[PDB]
Design a protein around this ligand. Structure first.
Ligand code: FES
Length: 117
C-alpha cells in the first residue's frame, strides 16, 4: 500500500520511476494503466526493462517478457504478476501489493486489476 502519483505523470508504455524504490513497472497500455511486480516467476530475480527490444529481460535464466508482462521466452512459466491500483480521494494512484492478479487465470480482467484513464 503506497502512492505513485497522478496518472498524468506517466506516458504510454513502460515507466521505470518506482522500479528502484518499489520494484514495479507502471505501464499505460492503449487505454489503461497497470502495475507490474518486477519479480521473475521462474525462481525470483529482478528482470530488466529493455526498451530497444520491447522486453523485460530476466538475467537469471534468460526469461523474456513482453511489455505487458506476458512470458514469451525462457524458463519463466507464467506472466509477471500485477498489483491492485486504485484512485485515492486526492486523485493519486494507490498501489496495494498485498493483492495480485494472475494474467493466466483471468484476474487481469477483474476489479482493481488496472485503471482505465
Ligand atoms: S529467475 Fe528469471 S529466468 Fe530464472
Amino acid at each position: 500500500r503506497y502512492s505513485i502519483g497522478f496518472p498524468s505523470q506517466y506516458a504510454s508504455g513502460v515507466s521505470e520511476k518506482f522500479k528502484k524504490q518499489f520494484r514495479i513497472w507502471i505501464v499505460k497500455e492503449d487505454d489503461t494503466l497497470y502495475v507490474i511486480e518486477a519479480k521473475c516467476t521462474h525462481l525470483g530475480c529482478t528482470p530488466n526493462w529493455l526498451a530497444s527490444e520491447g522486453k523485460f529481460k530476466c538475467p537469471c535464466h534468460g526469461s523474456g517478457f513482453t511489455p505487458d508482462g506476458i512470458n514469451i521466452e525462457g524458463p519463466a512459466p507464467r506472466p509477471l504478476e500485477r498489483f491492485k491500483v486504485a484512485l485515492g480521494d486526492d486523485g493519486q494512484i494507490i498501489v496495494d501489493e498485498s493483492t495480485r492478479y494472475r494474467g493466466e487465470r483471468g484476474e487481469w480482467d477483474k476489479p482493481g486489476a488496472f485503471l482505465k484513464v
